[PDB]
Amino acid sequence: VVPWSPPQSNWNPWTSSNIDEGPLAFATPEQISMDLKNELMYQLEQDHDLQAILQERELLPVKKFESEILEAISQNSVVIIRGATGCGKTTQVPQFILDDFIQNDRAAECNIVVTQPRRISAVSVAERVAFERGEEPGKSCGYSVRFESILPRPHASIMFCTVGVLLRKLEAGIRGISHVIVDEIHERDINTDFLLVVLRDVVQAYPEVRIVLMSATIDTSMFCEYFFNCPIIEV
Amino acid sequence: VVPWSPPQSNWNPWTSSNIDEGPLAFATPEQISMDLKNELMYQLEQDHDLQAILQERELLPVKKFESEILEAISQNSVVIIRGATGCGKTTQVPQFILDDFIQNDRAAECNIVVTQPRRISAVSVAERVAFERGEEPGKSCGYSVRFESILPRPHASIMFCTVGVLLRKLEAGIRGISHVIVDEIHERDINTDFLLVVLRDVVQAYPEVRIVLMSATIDTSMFCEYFFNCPIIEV
Ligand SMILES: Nc1ncnc2c1ncn2[C@@H]1O[C@H](COP(=O)(O)OP(=O)(O)O)[C@@H](O)[C@H]1O
Ligand SMILES: Nc1ncnc2c1ncn2[C@@H]1O[C@H](COP(=O)(O)OP(=O)(O)O)[C@@H](O)[C@H]1O
Ligand SMILES: C[As](C)(=O)[O-]
Ligand SMILES: [Mn+2]
Ligand SMILES: [Mn+2]
């Protein structure tokens, strides 16, 4: 079984290396958390376009359940979220988790990898999410696919990737990732199904990891059974 | 990686030990293969009940494609076999492979494991193929499931089993098995998909091995593409 530990201040989980150069070489988590809460406040009070996007975001179907989800993920090692295409699972849930950590002064304690079924999706979704936070990829949002990657920043960040990348990484280790999200599970894929076996081993060794599986269809019982009749949350 | 070698005259792949029972325990392959070709040829002449059954087999849709399938498998590490259910994939293909080896003085060079998606199919199929061969289970055919098994003879034989039984075997290795057949791949299943990954690793280290994937008429592209754009035999 592979090695894992929670996020640390002077560890970059995306480049899997100590941080030795730069401000964060010595910054404290409280400092990092406080810093990033303030940078959200500022980006709002300067980018006028951003307030309209957040407004378009409040309107999506999944927003009703922001609390049910955070709570369920926070209390359970594995959680299934399911619901029809168009609710906002893909583009919003990662953000709900991130923002929940930023607002409650916990931004240092959060990094999220999210898998997608295809190269296109890993990239377009990373762009989209960066766009919804008024950024370009590279800051709070990155991606990594075969041959091409714009890694996000070291802290309080989300990296989208193909399953291939994430499997290749699970060899070295996923030190410092707090959340792994497998999106579009309903789409049959071999490596993805294999990824679930590895992730299931990881959870057994490391209860404090958070796994979220996300389906567009009702056929979730196969996965629910595989992860010890874990919670299903409707959206 | 998993250990593997071709079948050897002294080795029983099913009990994973040296052969200490039956005829020609210590003989050469050339000798074992003659014996078995003779034993089959004779059985045909004497069992008139078996001759009715062979005519019944002759009419199955899959019969037509016998040569095409054998040629495809002999020339490729992996093959996929696709066809309407009822067609004869499950009950015949293993026999076509066995009988090709027996008939061309190679009986000793053939041992076939076949996975099924349910314990009951493993057994029911094993028992049916034994019947289409005028035998009880335990000679050219057997099975192995969690808690019960009737193992077949060590040479020129087929064992049916569950995906789990095989995954456990692959931990210790599958030395002496010439063909691995995964049946009913269209039935999505996590462990079955895990198996395919592992089998892909085997094929890379051991191109001499044969993998045969069997499917109802669905979109097999995903499999074809996982196994290096391998053939697809339409049936
Ligand atoms: N790249 C995009 N461009 C414009 N609108 C988008 C884009 N991605 C998502 N959206 C909007 O946000 C909605 C949510 O999609 P998504 O987050 O993928 O939800 P789900 O995962 O539940 O299908 C879409 O229905 C669409 O209206
Ligand atoms: N246990 C059995 N008893 C009698 N006939 C059988 C039995 N199993 C299979 N058959 C016959 O052989 C045919 C093919 O079975 P099978 O090899 O499972 O086809 P496939 O795998 O292509 O769906 C069936 O349509 C049936 O007529
Ligand atoms: C019972 As008989 C003659 O088919 O082996
Ligand atoms: Mn989605
Ligand atoms: Mn079948």
Side-chain angles (χ1 to χ4, degrees), chain A residues 1-20 22-38 40-42 44 47 49-50 52-54 57-167 169-235, chain B residues 1-145 147-235:
Chain A
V1 191
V2 319
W4 177 87
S5 66
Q8 210 181 295
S9 66
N10 68 338
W11 177 256
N12 179 322
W14 311 124
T15 59
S16 310
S17 49
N18 278 312
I19 306 133
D20 290 323
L24 312 173
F26 301 111
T28 78
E30 292 62 28
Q31 291 174 359
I32 293 159
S33 304
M34 173 265 134
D35 179 70
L36 284 162
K37 199 168 168 177
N38 273 54
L40 258 191
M41 273 201 76
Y42 191 101
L44 290 175
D47 196 345
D49 288 340
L50 194 54
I53 302 168
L54 296 203
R57 282 186 66 204
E58 300 229 343
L59 267 41
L60 288 156
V62 73
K63 179 63 154 198
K64 295 155 191 253
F65 309 108
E66 178 159 26
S67 284
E68 199 193 347
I69 293 165
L70 293 176
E71 202 196 9
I73 291 177
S74 195
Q75 297 189 305
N76 295 280
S77 270
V78 185
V79 158
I80 293 180
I81 302 182
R82 76 186 173 174
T85 297
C87 281
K89 295 179 292 298
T90 296
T91 62
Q92 308 302 307
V93 165
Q95 300 191 69
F96 298 167
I97 296 139
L98 181 54
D99 287 332
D100 185 65
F101 272 77
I102 291 174
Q103 292 319 307
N104 292 73
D105 303 311
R106 253 158 48 235
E109 298 191 8
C110 182
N111 294 91
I112 311 186
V113 61
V114 182
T115 65
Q116 297 288 316
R118 264 170 291 273
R119 201 178 190 285
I120 273 196
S121 319
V123 179
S124 23
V125 174
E127 276 163 353
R128 175 62 190 196
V129 174
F131 170 77
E132 295 193 9
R133 304 180 70 76
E135 296 160 35
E136 269 148 358
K139 196 174 187 194
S140 70
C141 282
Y143 67 81
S144 189
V145 304
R146 200 166 151 73
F147 298 137
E148 189 189 331
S149 73
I150 303 163
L151 308 182
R153 74 196 169 202
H155 297 107
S157 50
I158 303 163
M159 189 183 73
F160 298 78
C161 57
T162 47
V163 181
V165 164
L166 170 57
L167 280 166
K169 191 177 225 306
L170 281 149
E171 294 173 4
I174 47 152
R175 249 205 86 196
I177 308 282
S178 55
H179 300 72
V180 171
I181 299 177
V182 192
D183 206 20
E184 323 295 0
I185 47 177
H186 64 274
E187 284 175 58
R188 193 180 177 178
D189 179 70
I190 298 134
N191 284 318
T192 310
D193 281 345
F194 177 51
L195 170 55
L196 297 171
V197 190
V198 188
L199 290 166
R200 200 232 255 158
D201 283 329
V202 180
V203 144
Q204 283 183 286
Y206 305 110
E208 308 300 0
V209 189
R210 293 296 105 142
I211 314 292
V212 185
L213 307 182
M214 288 193 162
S215 176
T217 73
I218 198 140
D219 290 83
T220 65
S221 50
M222 168 179 33
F223 308 107
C224 188
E225 270 153 55
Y226 198 76
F227 288 94
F228 312 131
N229 309 290
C230 64
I232 298 165
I233 287 145
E234 309 291 354
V235 132
Chain B
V1 201
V2 182
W4 186 91
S5 32
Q8 283 170 37
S9 55
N10 61 307
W11 183 253
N12 181 327
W14 310 132
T15 62
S16 284
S17 54
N18 292 301
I19 299 168
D20 64 351
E21 258 172 57
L24 302 164
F26 315 130
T28 56
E30 291 69 8
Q31 296 182 277
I32 291 153
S33 300
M34 250 320 273
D35 188 50
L36 283 158
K37 185 166 175 191
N38 286 340
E39 181 173 295
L40 179 65
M41 185 218 81
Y42 178 79
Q43 192 198 16
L44 294 174
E45 295 189 312
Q46 305 315 298
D47 199 12
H48 294 307
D49 300 326
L50 181 76
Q51 282 166 335
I53 294 161
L54 287 186
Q55 271 163 316
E56 215 144 37
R57 286 180 66 202
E58 244 167 296
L59 315 159
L60 285 158
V62 67
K63 183 52 150 203
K64 309 187 277 275
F65 309 91
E66 171 168 21
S67 299
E68 189 179 0
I69 296 158
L70 296 167
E71 202 210 298
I73 300 172
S74 42
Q75 293 184 283
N76 293 273
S77 295
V78 187
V79 156
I80 300 191
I81 301 194
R82 199 171 101 97
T85 89
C87 168
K89 303 179 293 312
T90 288
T91 48
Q92 308 292 305
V93 170
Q95 298 193 66
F96 295 163
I97 301 164
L98 186 62
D99 286 333
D100 188 59
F101 274 74
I102 290 170
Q103 192 61 18
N104 285 84
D105 303 317
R106 282 180 295 154
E109 294 188 0
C110 188
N111 288 96
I112 308 183
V113 71
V114 188
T115 69
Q116 295 292 310
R118 283 167 205 85
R119 154 184 41 265
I120 206 198
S121 287
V123 181
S124 178
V125 175
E127 274 176 10
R128 169 65 181 191
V129 184
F131 175 86
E132 301 196 1
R133 296 188 77 77
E135 299 166 0
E136 298 281 349
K139 206 178 172 207
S140 71
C141 293
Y143 64 86
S144 189
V145 299
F147 314 131
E148 229 158 319
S149 71
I150 308 172
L151 298 185
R153 76 193 168 195
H155 289 321
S157 53
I158 307 154
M159 187 179 73
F160 295 82
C161 65
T162 39
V163 163
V165 169
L166 187 53
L167 289 177
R168 282 155 249 159
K169 200 170 179 88
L170 285 158
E171 287 165 29
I174 50 152
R175 167 157 173 246
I177 295 173
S178 69
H179 297 55
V180 166
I181 285 185
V182 185
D183 200 2
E184 324 293 7
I185 55 179
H186 54 287
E187 300 190 14
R188 183 172 189 183
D189 178 68
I190 288 166
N191 276 8
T192 295
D193 276 334
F194 174 19
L195 174 61
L196 296 178
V197 175
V198 176
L199 289 179
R200 198 222 233 158
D201 289 355
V202 178
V203 167
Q204 274 175 290
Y206 301 119
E208 296 93 346
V209 75
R210 288 335 201 217
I211 304 298
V212 175
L213 301 180
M214 299 198 156
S215 176
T217 63
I218 62 161
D219 196 41
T220 51
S221 351
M222 179 209 323
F223 298 116
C224 185
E225 290 161 48
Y226 190 80
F227 287 104
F228 312 134
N229 317 299
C230 70
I232 296 181
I233 281 57
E234 299 285 1
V235 140

